[PDB]
Amino acid sequence: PDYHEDIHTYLREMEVKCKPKVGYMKKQPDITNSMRAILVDWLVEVGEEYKLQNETLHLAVNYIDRFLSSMSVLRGKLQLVGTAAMLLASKFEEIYPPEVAEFVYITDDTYTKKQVLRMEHLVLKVLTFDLAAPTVNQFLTQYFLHQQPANCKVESLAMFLGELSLIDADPYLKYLPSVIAGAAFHLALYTVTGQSWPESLIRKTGYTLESLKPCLMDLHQTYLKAPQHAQQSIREKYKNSKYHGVSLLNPPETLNL
Amino acid sequence: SMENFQKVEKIGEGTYGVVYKARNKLTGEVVALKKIRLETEGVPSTAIREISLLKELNHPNIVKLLDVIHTENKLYLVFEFLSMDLKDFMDASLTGIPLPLIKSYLFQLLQGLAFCHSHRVLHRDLKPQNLLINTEGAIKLADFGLARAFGVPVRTYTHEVVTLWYRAPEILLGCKYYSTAVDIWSLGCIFAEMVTRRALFPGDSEIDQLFRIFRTLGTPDEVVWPGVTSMPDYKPSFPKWARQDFSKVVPPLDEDGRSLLSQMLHYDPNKRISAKAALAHPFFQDVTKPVPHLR
Ligand SMILES: O=C1N=C(NCc2cccs2)S/C1=C/c1ccc2ncccc2c1
Ligand SMILES: [Mg+2]
Predict the structure, then answer these.
(1) Are residues A82 and A201 in the same domain?
(2) In the record, which positions carry Phosphothreonine (chain B)?
(3) Domain CATH code at residue A180
(4) Is residue B92 domain-shared with residue B108, that is, in the same domain?
(5) Is A145 within 8 Å of B153 when comparing Cβ atoms?
(6) Cβ contact (<8 Å) for B151 and A91?
(7) Which of A28, A71, A96, A164 is 20 to 30 A distant from B62 in Cα terms?
(8) A30 and A14, same structural domain?
(9) A109: domain range?
């Protein structure tokens, strides 16, 4: 099908260039992984409240991680960075983005409009206006085209697992979106149908199960431990019929390979 | 800041903001400035989208963005300056645009467009006013204010898209999914316009636009466009116009010209020729790069 290969190649180029710094939190004096996890889980709620696309959620997190990779931020201002990031992602991705006033509302009177608007400009300057970032979602939708045949439970679980990876910078910040998407898809497909990463995707991506194993092992642990995780907005989201209640499914205890 | 730019003259508005011709006072460079006043909703999605995409796209047939400047009440985009837009050029041309120049412009536009599509960008406002030409024979896509980064496969995007005359029938009939084909349709209309010297489908409304397209290409049915009778804004009451010979639609065009245009104006988006495939159409076998000899 036309342009699918070119687009995939190009996205594989851009994910490297849009990659945040792997160990930036160590260099952040006042913020932690846990604090970022709180922030990301909150963005999930915002996405739910305003019925935003999952893509917007992923874009925002990329903006956040890229911003935090070069700017030190105090814990009290992290949410301002987050709010501004969600606003820009919405403007980039959404047909009908929420008004700035709505973004000031869900902060709970924490920041002012002028603060949100100034933060928008700062994020833009820091990101040098480069907002078209490849996401786990963008690879997932491509990978879904290789199902035989299409299974809606598999898709939702993949989207779910891929979303869980956004929460924890350790260890997912060291994996590319194309790789997390690979691991999410295989893990999803294995849980629902008992099938594995397909030959047709080995062909397309050049990723094998052996190559995905390191990420796939991490994602399997997160999945198993998801109900005990401090952050829970993603499990609650994917409980809904909209996502076929896939977060209620039982994860496998072994993966074989 | 804009200390170093001297505004020569306002040249128009397009999609969003106001475009000026200006001069860099230190280097002499002639530039185009697109000004945005910061509706206090922050930076507009149109500016956000145009800037990140134009920064991704380096190609001889896509306009070059040189710089972005914020003077905290406005936002300026700084482009290279060429000569004029294609609409300007066609209004000035009694004379006609010679075929070798039409072929060359079409060839370049398809290259610019294939580059966009290969890089997951829909332009969504291809029209003569948004195409720019210089004295040396080049033509470039400009005004990416209505553009967007699409995914594979596409989801539902903004329905507003494309200025009426250049708007693909799948948008008009309200299909929930549209993709790259809509840019091809727009280039088809422009191709015809360059040859005929008049717009192909100058509708004043959506239904007028559909009826004008039908009277040229035939009212579509399930054989020619599987699914069409089921589209949201398809009406069984549509008059049933017969399809006409392409030799009558663009009479000056020879056999390959007609073939390419009918492939660009194909009703079914999936069967409509890609910009990448169109580059190899035999129409372009003798393609050169003449100068427009404008002023
Ligand atoms: O010309 C441009 N047009 C844009 N949007 C639509 C419009 C067309 C004409 C007026 S408004 S953005 C843009 C940038 C630009 C760059 C170089 C140019 N060189 C010559 C003439 C116009 C130019 C415009
Ligand atoms: Mg730290």
Answers:
(1) no
(2) 15, 158
(3) 1.10.472.10
(4) yes
(5) yes
(6) no
(7) A96
(8) no
(9) 20-132
User: By C-alpha distance, which of B29, B30, B28 is closest to B20?
Assistant: B30
CA B214 to ligand 1 centroid distance, Å? 32
In a domain, A1, yes or no: no
A49 and A14 co-located in one domain: no
> What angle separates helix A113-126 from helix A54-68, to the nearest 10 degrees?
70
- For residues A227 and A175, state if they share a domain: yes
Contacts A–B by Cβ distance under 8 A: 84
A137/A250 same-domain check: yes
Secondary structure of B167-203 in HEC code, one letter for each residue: CCHHHHCCCCCCCCHHHHHHHHHHHHHHHHCCCCCCC
Q: Closest approach of chain A CAs to the CA of B17, in angstroms?
A: 17
Q: What is the resolution of this structure in A?
A: 2.4
Q: Which residue segment(s) compose the domain that B267 sits in?
A: 84-293
Q: How was this structure determined?
A: X-ray
Pairing label, strands B74-80, B121-122: unpaired
Number of domains in chain A: 2
Instruction: Tell me which of B15, B49, B83 is where a domain ends.
Output: B83
B245 labelled catalytic: no
Interface of B with A in 189-228 (CB under 8 A): none
Of B71, B80, B74, B67, give the one whose Cα is nearest residue B44.
Answer: B74
